[PDB]
Write a protein that binds this ligand. Structure first.
Ligand SMILES: *[B@]([O])([C]N1[C]=C([C][N]S(=O)(=O)C2=[C][C]=C([C])[C]=[C]2)N=N1)OP([O])([O])=O
Length: 355
């Protein structure tokens, strides 16, 4: 029956390459502790270099899952509390209005006045500090979700301060090794540059992500399909992992609040399983992703849960999804963006057909 996984992935993912003119794709499934890796197309059109198990892709927003894990790790080590405010760690923010927002509210986008992106003019360390010092509340703190790079970027910066190391080193020296990841990076080293895919924009031009303010915690991790399968494996089966990372992983699975059928965990989106296709698609609707939404307390605590997260950079699309009770998960990495709905639907069909 496992002979069907390749066929399902071919039926559901492979057509997206032609449909969206995507040069390269890697799709992985993990089921019952067995990994299946499917590679398509080219990591570099100009070089005619094939996608394979060494290919490094930009994860975009899926990077937020690592930030959340790093936060869970620091919390379980006693380095932070989710009730603390940023000013406890970034001294220059002490006694400023942003110092009334707690770390959980930053991590889960509920400061009430932070948009998807910083302003284009905000670039340097100094401009970032100033942005946060000048910050003033809008909506009541904790009450409205607006998905935000700055919000979780500040979260990540505070996590790093609490661990007395720059955020890149928190991931590369502490979190990635604890997860057993061998080719995951904030900064891809010279010795791996040959493995780094080009991304391709909507005009099919090769592109890679540009440096930006607090980029690393928001959208700055790069990884391979095998490493992302290992990450899903850790999420499905944390028992094998060191206690510290185990608690960190568990921390990311805890739903914090609800927006109808979408529960916001740390980094991860959470849903009741089984979830309808429309539930999973609407989690990435314009309304949820781009606009403020007033949240509620979790009322229905799902007995059986599933989690997902999309990610995009200019030249790359990512989707990761796992379902603990079914012991299954899927990762899709492309070096061109395709609509979220296609990613989510393809994964839905595959995981349902294997279930
Ligand atoms: B995260 O990666 C956060 N995220 C996504 C975006 C949209 N930028 S983009 O989709 O990469 C893009 C770049 C260039 C052009 C012309 C269009 C779109 N900004 N921050 O991803 P999600 O999936 O939204 O959670």
């Amino acid at each position: 029956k496992d002979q069907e996984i390749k066929k399902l992935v071919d039926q559901n993912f492979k057509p997206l390459l032609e449909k969206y003119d995507v040069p390269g794709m890697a799709v992985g499934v993990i089921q019952n502790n067995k990994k299946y890796e499917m590679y398509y197309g080219l990591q570099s059109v100009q070089d005619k270099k094939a996608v394979n198990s060494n290919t490094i892709f930009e994860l975009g927003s899926v990077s937020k899952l690592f930030t959340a894990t790093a936060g869970g790790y620091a919390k379980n080590k006693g380095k932070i509390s989710f009730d603390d405010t940023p000013g406890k760690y970034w001294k220059e923010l002490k006694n400023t209005p942003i110092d009334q927002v707690n770390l959980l509210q930053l991590a889960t986008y509920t400061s009430g006045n932070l948009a998807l992106q910083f302003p284009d003019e905000v670039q340097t360390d100094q401009q970032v500090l100033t942005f946060f010092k000048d910050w003033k509340p809008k909506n009541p703190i904790g009450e409205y979700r607006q998905y935000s790079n700055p919000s979780i970027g500040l979260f990540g910066k505070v996590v790093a301060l609490s661990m007395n190391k720059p955020f890149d080193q928190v991931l590369e020296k502490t979190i990635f090794p604890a997860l057993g990841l061998k080719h995951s990076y904030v900064n891809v080293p010279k010795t791996q540059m040959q493995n780094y895919a080009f991304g391709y924009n909507q005009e099919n031009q090769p592109i890679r992500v540009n440096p930006g303010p607090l980029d690393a915690p928001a959208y700055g991790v790069k990884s391979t399909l095998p490493d992302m399968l290992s990450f899903i494996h850790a999420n499905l089966n944390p028992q094998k992992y060191p206690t510290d990372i185990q608690r960190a992983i568990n921390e990311t699975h805890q739903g914090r609040y609800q927006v109808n059928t979408m529960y916001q965990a740390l980094g991860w989106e959470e849903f009741s399983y089984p979830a309808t296709l429309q539930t999973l698609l609407d989690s990435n609707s314009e309304q949820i992703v781009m606009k403020p939404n007033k949240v509620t307390a979790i009322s229905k605590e799902p007995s059986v849960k599933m989690y997902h997260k999309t990610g995009s950079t200019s030249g790359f699309g990512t989707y990761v999804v796992f379902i603990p009770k079914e012991n299954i998960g899927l990762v899709m990495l492309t070096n061109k963006r395709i609509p979220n709905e296609e990613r989510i639907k393809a994964a839905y069909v595959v995981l349902n057909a294997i279930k």
